[PDB]
């Protein structure tokens, strides 16, 4: 309440809508995968067991922020281009579940 001056949230206009069925993905970067061993095959269940992912929301997504310095195979729902590239560069495979 501003004393009768029109409040800010009526001076301003509304915009947008919410998508009720929106996909959000559990995020994991390459720097988190360095804890594993070379040649290992990582999966969502193995991620959860290792504690890297507390909650699989709509799938798991691999992003290329950090540096890998490893060689392993990965099975996930979505990947980023940089992530797949940096996986295959050191050796390894990405299998879209």
């Amino acid at each position: 309440f501003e004393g009768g001056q029109l409040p800010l949230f009526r001076r301003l206009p509304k915009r947008g809508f919410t998508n009720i069925n929106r996909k959000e993905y559990a995020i994991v970067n390459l720097d988190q995968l360095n804890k594993f061993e070379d040649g290992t095959e990582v999966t969502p269940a193995l991620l959860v067991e290792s504690g890297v992912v507390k909650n699989e929301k709509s799938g798991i997504k691999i992003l290329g922020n950090g540096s890998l310095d490893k060689k392993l195979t990965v099975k996930a729902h979505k990947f980023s281009a940089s992530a797949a590239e940096a996986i295959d560069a050191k050796g390894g495979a990405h299998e879209v579940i």
Binding site: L8, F9, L12, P13, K14, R15, G16
Partner: protein, 64 residues
């Protein structure tokens, strides 16, 4: 009991990464012919809620 959210503000503003609130611009949605194209395109640029207004409306959006 729980605090309640101001819904009119909720569907007028969003929260940025650090702590700030990003808003939409007024003086749209109606007569532009009196205005210039410069004003038109510049009222499409987003802005932030001012801190003087945050000091007043902070509690309305705590759950945002």
């Amino acid at each position: 009991p729980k605090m309640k959210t101001h819904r009119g503000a909720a569907k007028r503003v969003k929260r940025t990464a650090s702590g700030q609130l990003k808003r939409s611009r007024a003086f749209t949605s109606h007569l532009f012919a009196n205005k210039s194209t410069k004003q038109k395109r510049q009222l499409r640029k987003a802005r932030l809620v001012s801190k003087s207004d945050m000091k007043r409306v902070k509690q309305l959006l705590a759950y945002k």
